[PDB]
């Protein structure tokens, strides 16, 4: 499953997504991907400055990067639903998608941020994904619910 998803990592490239999801959702995906990678790259550059030999990325649980990753997962899930043309995926479809998502983002860290391949591992991403798929204030809960609604609406070409 992870073997086939390695080639299928290109499936989340903008050029492969184009015309298969709405223009609005595609732009949300492009922006959310860029935002997360930029934050990862900043955090890494600081870490590397302090230990040039390090090979691990420490994921800070209370960080802008972490919040940006959550939002990227939210957009990613709607990308999946957009590709399938469904509101609720089969669990096998979800498992396939999240594998492709994790392979895609891990490749981007090695290829686009030039991080050691072992730093942003498939396993690390999966730990955080499990959190997404399974002490936040009430106002921030509201915020995330309104954002998810806006992404869902983008996916449906502006429809509820």
From Swiss-Prot:
Region of interest (DNA-binding JBP1 domain), ranges: 1-160
Protein's cellular compartments: Nucleus
Stated consequence of mutating residue 128 to A: Decreases binding affinity for both J-DNA and normal DNA
Region (Disordered): 138-160
Listed Basic and acidic residues bias regions: 138-156
Site for Involved in J base recognition and binding, conferring specificity towards J-DNA, residues: 131
Quaternary structure and partners: Monomer. Binds to DNA as a monomer.
Biological role: Dioxygenase that catalyzes the first step of DNA base J (beta-d-glucosyl-HOMedU) biosynthesis by converting thymine to 5-hydroxymethyluracil (HOMedU). DNA base J is a hypermodified thymidine residue found in the genome of kinetoplastid parasites, which is localized primarily to repetitive DNA, namely the telomeres, and is implicated in the regulation of antigenic variation. Also specifically binds to base J-containing DNA (J-DNA).
Entry's family note: Belongs to the TET family. JBP1 subfamily.
Comment on protein domains: The DNA-binding JBP1 domain (DB-JBP1) is necessary and sufficient for binding to J-DNA.
Protein known as: Thymine dioxygenase JBP1
Full-length numbering of the shown residues: 395 to 561 of 827
